[model samples]
Target chain A: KNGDAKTFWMELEDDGKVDFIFEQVQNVLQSLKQKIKDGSATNKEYIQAMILVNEATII
Target chain B: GDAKTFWMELEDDGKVDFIFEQVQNVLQSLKQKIKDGSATNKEYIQAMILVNEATIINS
Candidate 1:
């Protein structure tokens, strides 16, 4: 898995509150990067893991 | 005239810094809301009222 593909952005509210809309996205991508680093999961497996985590959180 | 309504939410700092973004947004909206009024020639009449009566002492 390529461990270098990740991006995120945050929007600042009018009240100066920083909204982390992409934090969760980055977290999952970073986790995939870490799995690649550790040689425990391929990019496909990491992607699957991320999807599972997201689905679990939604439920 | 329908009182043009502007609404905003502010976040509090961990320190004492006041968040003025909401006030600014609301004031701009209010100015637009009261464009047809003959209250005053100022851009922000209500804010001007607040400014005129405001007193801050740091001594």
Candidate 2:
């Protein structure tokens, strides 16, 4: 939960496609974040979004 | 390969267009982030969306 997950497990297919793919993942995180901020998201959604930005990325 | 199977082919163009547009927007967002150095394969390959078949979901 504290450390960003290292990409040692996921395989790379089209390496070029990865350029901003992380941020797109970030965009998905934000939409979910906004849901939590607006008080419309469930507890599970909150944990998942937090994991997306905080633990998922190195920052 | 079986990529076509994972994605649905709707009888309705309207439904198909909706998902198609969403997909492009997400990918393009990644393009801008890649340009600005906000996202990269070095740090985010694991969270990346595109992946290999069967083996990825098998576990």
Candidate 3:
């Protein structure tokens, strides 16, 4: 939880729609980081978001 | 040569829109639950909502 550095490496299907989905994923990750910094969101929230993101992309 | 994963299958079947619609439905329901103080883990739901928002962005 403390030292896990997130990376943006992704292998996506060779399709425009799939590419766009991961683009949005990165946006979501950034949005979470902003909320965390602003004290409106917790590290726990970021963790949960990342879990879903992984589920979406790891397929 | 390779079997499609669930996500790929969803994409091929043109069910991505349906998947995203369901995601938004879950997001709205979670928001309502949080508003009514019924969310078991408010932060977790908030995090999921955030990701879903980004996931469905103009895609």
Candidate 4:
């Protein structure tokens, strides 16, 4: 995981990469949240999704 | 007007790097389930919010 994040950070050196990733994470979070509300996904799924989204921000 | 210095301090103290890596580990496993690959601005603005939360928790 640490290496994965390190790779992500290294990739972000490219212009606009971070922008794209951030948006994708946000979109996924919204989708996950909606799915949880509709019962299409479990609470754990959304929790995991939210955690990932937040983690991306840190990386 | 509204603001906070908490985040700035974390960044200055280099705690941000530690928290960033911590977030990374959580994200790696979390990514296994919610891959937004199928799916913003000032990217740091969004990141800062999560980083602040991570810093607060560690403190």
Candidate 5:
């Protein structure tokens, strides 16, 4: 699920695309929250779990 | 302190401003983090205490 597709604005010169980065960040955070809540991991394990999950999803 | 003032953009709808909203969101998150114990006031407290410690050393 694409969490909260909100739009943000910036100066024309400073404008840059963020759809991909935002999606990745959202996915990692969502996955981490899910894994932690399932009793399979701790919040302290967010970094490692995010990396692992990101890799697994990509491959 | 205003944490990382990054910029983003959206199609001009004349209904939104990202910079101001982002600053507000970040500040709110900062306050929440402090209140939730995820971040501490200790860093700022130390700065205040440093002045007191310096006064004690001089007097």
Candidate 6:
């Protein structure tokens, strides 16, 4: 990855917008977990979750 | 308003891993908020997250 940092963490946190972001993050992760269930997850879905988790840790 | 269906797939700590104490906090609070709320469709929630994902991926 390039040395790029264009995140809105501070602004969002300052404006109190991250509460909204946090809600969505939890929802997506929960839905993703439920979707996998007993069956194995699709490769594409796995990549999506992995990437999402990566983004969620930007703070 | 009612929303469309949402879908995803993932594993249990299979590939994805998390980090940062701040990120964990967000998830912690969000889970409580999620449990208190009633919305459960992936369409509304995941798309919102996807917008953040683009920002996350690009930014």
lDDT of 4 by residue, B1-59 (tens): 01123323544565544544565554443332223331122333335344434333323
In model 4 chain A, the worst 10-residue window by lDDT is A1-10
Candidate 1 residue-wise lDDT, A1-59, digit = tens: 22211100011223332123123333443454344445465545444433332322221
Would you list the rank order by TM-score, best first?
6, 3, 2, 4, 5, 1
Candidate 4: segments with Cα more than 4 A from true spot: A1-10, A42-44, A53-59, B1-59
Error of 5 at B57 (Å): 42
Clash pairs of candidate 2? none
All candidates' TM-scores?
0.23, 0.35, 0.36, 0.34, 0.26, 0.39
Best by DockQ: 6
Give the clash count for each candidate. 0, 0, 0, 0, 0, 0
Please provide, for model 5 over A17-48, each residue's C-alpha lDDT reduced to its tens digit, 9 standing for 90 to 100: 32333334344444444444444544334334
Per-residue alpha-carbon lDDT of candidate 6 for residues B1-59, written as tens digits (9 for 90 to 100): 11111122112334322332344464564434444443244323543465466345423
Deviating ranges (above 4 Å) for candidate 6: A1-7, A38-42, A52-59, B1-59
What are the fnat scores of the candidates, in the order listed?
Answer: 0.00, 0.03, 0.09, 0.04, 0.00, 0.07
DockQ per candidate, 2 decimals: 0.01, 0.05, 0.05, 0.05, 0.02, 0.09
Candidate 5 vs 6: which has more TM-score: 6
Judging by lDDT, tell me the better candidate of 3 and 5.
3
RMSD list, candidates in order: 24.3, 13.9, 16.5, 15.4, 21.9, 13.0
| Cα lDDT of model 2 by residue, A1-59, tens digit | 22432332222223454434444554554555455445575655544433333333231
Q: Per-residue lDDT tens digits of candidate 2, residues B1-20? A: 12222122221223433443
Q: Which residue window of length 10 is worst by lDDT in model 2 chain B?
A: B50-59
- Overlapping backbone residue pairs in candidate 4 total 0
User: Which whole-number lDDT from 0 to 100 does residue B17 have in model 3?
Assistant: 52
